Design a binder for these strands. Structure first.
Ligand SMILES: O=c1ccn([C@@H]2O[C@H](COP(=O)(O)NP(=O)(O)OP(=O)(O)O)[C@@H](O)[C@H]2O)c(=O)[nH]1
Ligand SMILES: [Mg+2]
Ligand SMILES: [Mg+2]
Ligand code: NA
Length: 327
DNA sequence: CGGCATACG
DNA sequence: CGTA
DNA sequence: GCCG
C-alpha cells in the first residue's frame, strides 16, 4: 500500500465503509479545531481503508499500512471489538461539533466565521436569521436557500442543468464546450452541487467568456444568486421540479484549452486526491502542480499536456480514471 | 523536527 | 474572509 | 497524527 492516495486506485464504494466514516468524523472535528495536520492524517487513514480489497476484520491487518499509528489504530480496534468508538461518539453528540457542522454547511460560512459565531453564543440557523445585519450578502443567500441546498443533487438532475448551461454558453461563444467535472464525473449518484468546466478549442477565444455566460443565465431567470472580469463562478441556480423548482449550487470554471487537462484533473477531484497529487508532485518529483499547469522550477518550464493521461505519465504515476480517484 | 495543496472571488 |  |  503506497503512502500517497494518488498512487493507488480508490473506488467510490468499498469494503470498509463504517471504519472510514468514523475516521472522517475525527478528521472533520480536527478541522473545526484548526488542526490541519490531524485532519490530513485522519483523512489519509480513512482513504487507505477505501483502497483495501476486502474488509478489515482484525487489528493485525493494519500492520504496515501507511497513516495508521496509535490513534487511528485504536479507533479501528474499538469499532472491531465493540461496534462503536467512544471518542467518535463523544464528538458526534458534542455541541461544538454539531454547531460547527451546521454553520460551516452554510454557503458563505467557513470554519473561522462559524467558530466566531460559536464563541459569541450562537447555536442555530434561527439565531443567525435574527441578526441579519451581521451577515454578508453571500451568507444571506446561503441561509435563505439552506434547506434546498441541504437536499442532494441527483445525477438525474444533472443532464437538464447541463443543457441550459450549454445553451447560454453557445450564445456567449459558439463552439465553446461544457464538461461535467467534480463528484459526478467520478461516478457519484448524488452531490452537493454540480461542477462544470468550460473551454473553447481555439486558444484565447475563452477570454472574457464567463461574464457573458452569467449574464445570459441571469437573463433567462435561472440565477438565484451569484457574485456579480472573472473565470470561476459559485452560483445558486433555479432547477425545475414537478410543479415547482428547487435551488441548486452550480460551479462554473473557464479555462483556456492549453490548460484544460490541468483544469479537468484539478476540478474532478476528489479533494483529498488533488491535495495528495500536488504533494506528491512537489515532494517526490520537484514539480509544482496547480489547475493551470505543471511547473519545473529548475528549468523554469511548463509541461505541455494534451490529456490527463499526459499528466499522470509526466509524474511517473499509473493512470487512474476519475472513478478511481475517490480518495 | 518540518511539513501538511493551491488559487481565484 | 469566502469559494473550488 | 503521522511520515520521512
Ligand atoms: O478545497 C477544495 C475543494 C474542491 N477542490 C476541487 O474541486 C472539486 C469540486 O469541488 P466540490 O466542492 O464541488 N466537491 P465534489 O468532489 O464535487 O463533491 P460534492 O460535495 O458532491 O460536490 C473537488 O473534487 C476538488 O477537485 C479542491 O481542489 N479543493
Ligand atoms: Mg461538486
Ligand atoms: Mg463545486
Ligand atoms: Na460553508
Amino acid at each position: 500500500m503506497p503512502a500517497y492516495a494518488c498512487q493507488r486506485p480508490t473506488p467510490l464504494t468499498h469494503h470498509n465503509t463504517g471504519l472510514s466514516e468514523a475516521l472522517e468524523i475525527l478528521a472533520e472535528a480536527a478541522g473545526f479545531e484548526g488542526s490541519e495536520g490531524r485532519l490530513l492524517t485522519f483523512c489519509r487513514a480513512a482513504s487507505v481503508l477505501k483502497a483495501l480489497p476486502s474488509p478489515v476484520t482484525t487489528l493485525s491487518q493494519l500492520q504496515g499500512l501507511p497513516h495508521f499509528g496509535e490513534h487511528s489504530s485504536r479507533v479501528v480496534q474499538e469499532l472491531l471489538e465493540h461496534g462503536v468508538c467512544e471518542e467518535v461518539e463523544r464528538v458526534r453528540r458534542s455541541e461544538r461539533y454539531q454547531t460547527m457542522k451546521l454553520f460551516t454547511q452554510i454557503f458563505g460560512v467557513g470554519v473561522k466565521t462559524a467558530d466566531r459565531w460559536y464563541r459569541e453564543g450562537l447555536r442555530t440557523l434561527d439565531d443567525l436569521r435574527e441578526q441579519p445585519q451581521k451577515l454578508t450578502q453571500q451568507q444571506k443567500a446561503g441561509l435563505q436557500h439552506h434547506q434546498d441546498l441541504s437536499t442532494p443533487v441527483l445525477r438525474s438532475d444533472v443532464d437538464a442543468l447541463q443543457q441550459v448551461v450549454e445553451e447560454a454558453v453557445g450564445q456567449a461563444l459558439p463552439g465553446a464546450t461544457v464538461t461535467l467535472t467534480g463528484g459526478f464525473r467520478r461516478g457519484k449518484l448524488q452531490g452537493h452541487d454540480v461542477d462544470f468546466l468550460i473551454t473553447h478549442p481555439k486558444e484565447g477565444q475563452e477570454a472574457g467568456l464567463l461574464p457573458r455566460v452569467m449574464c445570459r443565465l441571469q437573463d433567462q431567470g435561472l440565477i438565484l444568486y451569484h457574485q456579480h472580469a472573472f473565470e470561476r463562478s459559485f452560483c445558486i441556480f433555479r432547477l425545475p421540479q414537478p410543479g415547482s423548482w428547487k435551488a441548486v449550487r452550480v460551479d462554473l470554471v473557464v479555462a483556456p484549452v492549453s490548460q484544460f487537462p490541468f483544469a479537468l484533473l484539478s476540478w474532478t477531484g476528489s479533494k483529498l486526491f488533488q491535495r495528495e497529487l500536488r504533494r506528491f508532485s512537489r515532494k517526490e518529483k520537484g514539480l509544482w502542480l496547480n489547475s493551470h499547469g505543471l511547473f519545473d522550477p529548475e528549468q523554469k518550464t511548463f509541461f505541455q499536456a494534451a490529456s490527463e493521461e499526459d499528466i499522470f505519465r509526466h509524474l511517473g504515476l499509473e493512470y487512474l480514471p476519475p472513478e478511481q480517484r475517490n480518495a
